[PDB]
Motif scaffolding. Sequence first.
Motif, short mmCIF file in Angstrom:
data_model
loop_
_atom_site.label_atom_id
_atom_site.label_comp_id
_atom_site.label_asym_id
_atom_site.label_seq_id
_atom_site.Cartn_x
_atom_site.Cartn_y
_atom_site.Cartn_z
N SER A 89 0.79 -1.38 -0.03
CA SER A 89 0.06 -0.03 0.01
C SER A 89 0.73 1.33 -0.08
O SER A 89 0.31 2.28 -0.46
N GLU A 119 -9.64 -3.96 2.85
CA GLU A 119 -8.52 -3.52 3.88
C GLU A 119 -9.31 -2.60 4.93
O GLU A 119 -10.13 -2.26 5.09
N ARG A 120 -8.22 -1.93 5.65
CA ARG A 120 -8.58 -1.28 6.87
C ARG A 120 -9.57 0.05 6.70
O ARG A 120 -8.85 0.94 5.69
N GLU A 142 -7.52 3.74 6.53
CA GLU A 142 -6.40 4.22 5.41
C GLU A 142 -7.09 4.78 4.33
O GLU A 142 -6.55 5.21 3.35
N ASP A 145 -6.34 -2.69 -4.66
CA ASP A 145 -5.59 -3.15 -3.60
C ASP A 145 -5.98 -4.39 -2.95
O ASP A 145 -7.01 -4.35 -2.41
MG LIG Z 1 -2.28 -2.32 2.67
#
Ligand SMILES: [Mg+2]
Lengths: 64, 412, 412, 405, 412, 149
Positions: free
Chosen positions: E150, E172-173, E176, E232
Amino acid sequence: HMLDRILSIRKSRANRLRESMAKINSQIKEVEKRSLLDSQKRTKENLQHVNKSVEKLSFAIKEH
Amino acid sequence: EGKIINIGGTIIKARLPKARIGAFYKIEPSQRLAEVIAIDEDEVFLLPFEHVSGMYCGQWLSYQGDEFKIRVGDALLGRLIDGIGRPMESNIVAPYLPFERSLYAEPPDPLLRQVIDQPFILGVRAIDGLLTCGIGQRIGIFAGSGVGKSTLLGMICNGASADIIVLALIGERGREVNEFLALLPQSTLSKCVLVVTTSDRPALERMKAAFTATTIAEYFRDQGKNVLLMMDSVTRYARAARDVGLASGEPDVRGGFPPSVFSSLPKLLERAGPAPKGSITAIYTVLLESDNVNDPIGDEVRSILDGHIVLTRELAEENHFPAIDIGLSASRVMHNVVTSEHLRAAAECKKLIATYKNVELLIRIGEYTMGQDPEADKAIKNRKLIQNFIQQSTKDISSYEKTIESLFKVVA
Amino acid sequence: EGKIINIGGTIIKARLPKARIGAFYKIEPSQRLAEVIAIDEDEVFLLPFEHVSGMYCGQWLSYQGDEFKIRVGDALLGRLIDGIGRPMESNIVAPYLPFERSLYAEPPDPLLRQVIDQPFILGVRAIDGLLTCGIGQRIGIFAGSGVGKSTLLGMICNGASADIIVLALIGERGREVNEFLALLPQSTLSKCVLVVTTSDRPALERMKAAFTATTIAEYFRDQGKNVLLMMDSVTRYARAARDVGLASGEPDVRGGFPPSVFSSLPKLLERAGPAPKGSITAIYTVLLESDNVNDPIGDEVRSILDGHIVLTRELAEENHFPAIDIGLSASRVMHNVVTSEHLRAAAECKKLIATYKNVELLIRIGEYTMGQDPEADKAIKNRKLIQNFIQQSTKDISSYEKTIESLFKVVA
Amino acid sequence: EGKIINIGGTIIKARLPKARIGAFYKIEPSQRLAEVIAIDEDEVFLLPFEHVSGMYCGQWLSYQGDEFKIRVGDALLGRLIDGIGRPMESNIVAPYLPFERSLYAEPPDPLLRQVIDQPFILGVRAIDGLLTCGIGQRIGIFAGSGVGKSTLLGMICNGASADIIVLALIGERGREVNEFLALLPQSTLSKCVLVVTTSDRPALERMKAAFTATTIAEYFRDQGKNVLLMMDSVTRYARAARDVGLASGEPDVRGGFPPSVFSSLPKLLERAGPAPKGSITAIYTVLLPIGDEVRSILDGHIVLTRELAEENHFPAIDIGLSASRVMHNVVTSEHLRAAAECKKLIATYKNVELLIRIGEYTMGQDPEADKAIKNRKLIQNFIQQSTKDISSYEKTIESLFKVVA
Amino acid sequence: EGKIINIGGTIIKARLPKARIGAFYKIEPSQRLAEVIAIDEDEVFLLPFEHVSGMYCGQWLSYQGDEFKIRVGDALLGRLIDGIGRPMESNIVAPYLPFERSLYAEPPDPLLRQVIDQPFILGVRAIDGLLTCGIGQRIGIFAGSGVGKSTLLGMICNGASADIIVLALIGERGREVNEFLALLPQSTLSKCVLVVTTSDRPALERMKAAFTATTIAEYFRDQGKNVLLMMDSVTRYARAARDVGLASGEPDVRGGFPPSVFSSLPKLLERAGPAPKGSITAIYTVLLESDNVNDPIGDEVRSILDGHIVLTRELAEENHFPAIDIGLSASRVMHNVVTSEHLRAAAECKKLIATYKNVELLIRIGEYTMGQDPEADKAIKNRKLIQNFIQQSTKDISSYEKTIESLFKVVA
Amino acid sequence: SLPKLLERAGPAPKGSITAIYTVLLESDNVNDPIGDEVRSILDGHIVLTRELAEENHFPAIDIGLSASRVMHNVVTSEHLRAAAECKKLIATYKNVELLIRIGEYTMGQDPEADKAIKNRKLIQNFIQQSTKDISSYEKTIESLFKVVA
Ligand SMILES: [Mg+2]
Ligand SMILES: Nc1ncnc2c1ncn2[C@@H]1O[C@H](COP(=O)(O)OP(=O)(O)O)[C@@H](O)[C@H]1O
Ligand SMILES: Nc1ncnc2c1ncn2[C@@H]1O[C@H](COP(=O)(O)OP(=O)(O)O)[C@@H](O)[C@H]1O
Ligand SMILES: [Mg+2]
């Protein structure tokens, strides 16, 4: 795994000191030789030093 | 008689009431074969090997017999036979094969299989002087690839002291069988029987080829001759038996091999020993790889056989043919086969070879001169004649008494 | 009594109700038997005694006895027995065996077993000197394939001085019956029962030979005399139990093996040992499947036996015969059967073998000077005396007094 | 002719009586098709080619066949063919095709394989001066990623003495088919018949592309013509047949491959050899688990390396570790021994360049490496040329014989 | 139109006779949607759009659509979209998307794709000077956990020159999304579409965000402009599809993955690339299970994608960021793009990095005399210029002319 | 079902049970699943190796692999310091052991390695103990103070 790579340098150092031993032993016959046996004497004691450096490094693989 | 119910890819089912096990069947539209491996109530499981995609629901079966047999007779000397037991060639009419043997027999009574005491003359000075075979000993040659297994193997075929040779090449490709049976002359092929199957054949035939060669050699044993069986690459027999056992459905236990491989090696190669009438000296081969040094087939074959020969790659990289590592290889029935003076001579030559390896690594180290070790100096001065005793060219065949004479020369 | 509804290659399923587990049956159009492994409502899963490759669906099972029992008497002294129990010697007349008993008996009471403190002379000088046995213990010989197990049993059977010797050859090379029989004199064979099964025999008979050998040993124990049970490859029993258990639908738990193998080893290996009336001293061989002591079945057998001898290939290829690794082998009655000066001297000899193994690289390349460590100095000084004490030939049997005398001589 | 029982993601089950394994059936409302992998007593496991969405319980399956065969004729020269057999584009109309033959044909047994004669000229001067190859010889090329093998294939298509040239782009990327056809002329395309398929395409037709190309090349073999077969990335055939195999259900044995690909790849490769009708020169590319099984199964390996391709020495082949196994049956003894002495004249340079990297090596007595230093550049412009540099067979012989001087 | 019969963890099962696949239904008591993923001839497997809070047996379903479509249009720039297609920011007014598109389209005709010739200026000095990317190339970034996938997309997305950027943040989180918007300037945020789904979201939003991003990218491709798509962790798509399909009655095949993952991933991952009008250029972050080589979902993504940058954490442990292993990474589309002297400079300094990675050992071990290896003597002198050319800071973006000038002065 | 066995043996509102559990490992590896789980349940582990059983170092406790969770609440600060310094001497000798076995160690470079070589024999005949021998706690800790310095 990189200790296997070191004796590949140590044994190749041995080959490049016994082919140089064969260089001086080829030209002790033509002659300066007393000044030239000074080089094989440092060669052969280093070749004994390199051969000792392999047999304590090829035996050091079995200990792990 | 019975029809296919379903096809599950590699194993088929068919309804046959009161079908026995071990039988083999003809598919009636084609000419294809398949055996029975498992019996249900009415709907037997059944293993095909040749072709699967030409199958309907309701395709008929055809009965032949209870157990699969082969045609065996004394006209087989000089024939390329299929692994299932058929003559491959069509240039000759199949001769008179009167007898009718099955592939699954049993070894003799262990109180009749008696002690082996006579030597098996072999021609190679390394396998016969330092090591020694016996008439009934099952040798196993553990070779790699590119060490000279086939050259040594043809040296065994040509210079042996046997009456009938029975080769068996299990997993091969056609260039290698043509190269190997072009390597041994017509004086060898006039006594030789060839059970040849190749790697394009299905797995059942590459498994049955070992049984076929062992059955031919049991027949030529039961008339009272010294048969020499040569299974080439029992590794590839083991791969064929692995594929058959996994296609039957069977959990692998060691190295990806089912239990049927490990239970079928001993009942294969325990048949090839001494007998109360004649005897068979067998010599198997295992291809050891650098990928798996574990290799469960190699360990189990070493655990079943008695006397192994190791062909190393170092002794092929320096020109030492045949590349037999003496001292890493041994024979078990030697102490009751050779005489006592030959047994004390051959031990001293092996001790000289090992002592020379130690003394060369102690003489390049700087800490040896001549005089403070008597066992070293004699190995130093006997290096070149020991190397002239071990090394042997392909067309230099020696006799047994010459081998013992040159060995008594080379020790002292 | 009931028909067959499945034949699966190892386990056959029979629709017959009210079958007691453990009972056995006869397939009545043959003379073959089968023993009930598991039952269902009315569908028992049972295991044949002979092979399975001739059977079909509707095939009856007549009822036989409720438990498979062998016949044992005093007239087994000097005979050849199979794993089922029936004699191999056909030309020798059938003995009169008046008693009969089942193969599954319990061990003695753990309080009625006794602490063992009398030494058992084996004849092998290394085991006697550095390791040692007790009359009643269960020692084990761990090695790879072809390392020296069978040789050491022959040496240890010529050396031992028991009353009855019961030798079980389980799953081994069928040639070797006459070799074990020809290394024994007649006064030893007059007191020796020999239970022989072979690696060709099916997965029950190669499994059940250990229990008939242990049952014969318990009979001659209950007559009141100290007997010796030497068993050749208990790991062949382990492989047979693995194949039967995995055919009977049991999960892999460790290394290929079902939990029934690890549950069935301790009762076999535990019904041997001390007793209120007599004792059986057992010596088992274990075939480590690679050259590693931490095999699954090798570790499981080592955690049950009390004393273990480890043979290694690194001393076989150095001609250090016998190949007894003094480090990885130990006896669990060593400190209990022998006096204190022998224990002190054995411990010091083991320690100075270890301290030579510390140093020998510095000796090889010429670096070790003499007077700086007295333990290593005494190691280098007494090396040759030790390795004349450790090695011995198969023909050299040494009594216990000369063994402890040379042990005191070599430890200094 | 059968209703669909259920959809298991990539497996269809149907209710239809009496079908053979490998028979391909027809989704009638949508015009998609799907072939049989297993039968039950009345139900049938089959698997679709295309995507499976839009399907419901009770769709019909038209019979329309019992094994798949390709409609192949003489008019396929210069056309784009799918792995199944239908054309790629719709700008051209499909011509007359009289014949059709199935994708299976048993090869002869290996015990009686014919002798090789009649040198077959590929066009790259390096091998037919050094590692020659006959008519019926099948050749394996062992190349890497980014080594410039696509130019090599395009320039051994351009300048080959073959009347028909058949190539199978089996499993290629999206751009790479135009990247390959951009370097073929029109005189070459009017000699080619070529099968393409991409990684978009299902694994079933991505493994039948190989059998389609082999079958079409066997058709042009029977008309008295010398034909060249190319199969680019045999490994992509291997992974496609792997996906078909363990998509049908089969445990793997070696690497990740089922034994079905180990039964199908010698069957696919053992055929296509020296027939008496004018035969079929196969060139099979393998990139660097089964390369052992391929390298032990056909005669002649050609190795392309990145360690040589990092310089501008194209074609990026190293003769010191590649050799075609049949040269004495092909080329004369003078040319063979001159080629072998040039091979060991190259092979002694790399054992003496490393010794002249350090300052030690002189002349005086070494008759094999002193010749390489002077006669290096004639070697090193004999064994390389550009993409559209053709060198005929009656020039490389006397050029090689003035290289040895 | 049907009743729900069971609720799993991820899966719903209902009785919808003659229902199509892809036809999405809403649940009548509870307003939430669910689409059909499998048939079992009377009994269908559905996958719901949300969680399963209260789901009683026999809960109804109602027909909504035959396939699921998303609303696209040109008025989508500067916005945030979830995996379904609806906008994710709620304080803003809802836009007007004119057209609708299904998520499953087909890749372009391979005979009508253009030829990649001109470079895509990427921003990082290593993937411009050594592995140059073309406009229309599909590259992938392969690393383990937290190795810097990332962060490298932040460095690319900061210095990107594309006409329109579609950024897919798949599984993903949630943290971010603001860290990516913190390094998007307004000039490239006015033309960027973020399709973001978080790792806590249900299975098919995380499974269909990749299709939503590729659908938006194909829309703005078909307008006629070149577009940068950056996914991603497409491995999050892969294991979302694994958890969906493997719980729908479908077997494990290579990693826990069904065959449907390996059927649906090469169709998603290939419908980018060149086109008759426009070109999607795609950068796919790929997460790896271990740091091994036999990853069942990393290897085939490596195989079907033209160019790959391999980040190894062994360079992230010596703090060498970006951790690009230039020997393990490649770019098949750079020899068609850059000039010949650029190729020579790139190959020369890759050769210098590969030389210093093993000359380094015999610098520390004191065995390197100067001059004996001149290339290594050139790889020790220019070590510092290379190691300032390769690794650069996160906020250090550089134009293409500075990269090629610095490449030339590093190689010279 | 293993934590609801092992957690019943500890301190209590009246009385106490101090428990010592023998754990056999399925190889010599300590990362056996039962060895790992029982190490994560119990309050201290004493790992005995086979290398020290082959070297005739009995009892074969490997000091670096061993631990005792409760020791810092039990012993004084001086005794904890002496224990830590003795364990660091053992680890220093295990570092320099193969280097002196090969033959590179010349006396004089490291200050800790000469300390390890000098206190080697004192540490060895402190750790090594015979079966029929028991020590009292005061003789143990005063011999520890004599060995450690
Ligand atoms: Mg990442
Ligand atoms: N004590 C010994 N002395 C000499 N040779 C031995 C000894 N033990 C084993 N051998 C060698 O090993 C071979 C037999 O090994 P054996 O013990 O039968 O292996 P296994 O334990 O697998 O049966 C013989 O050929 C012999 O040369
Ligand atoms: N180019 C870089 N420069 C400095 N540190 C980096 C760089 N790339 C990654 N890191 C460090 O490595 C860790 C992983 O970063 P990240 O990109 O989040 O990995 P991933 O997204 O692959 O899990 C971060 O905590 C960061 O500090
Ligand atoms: Mg034995």
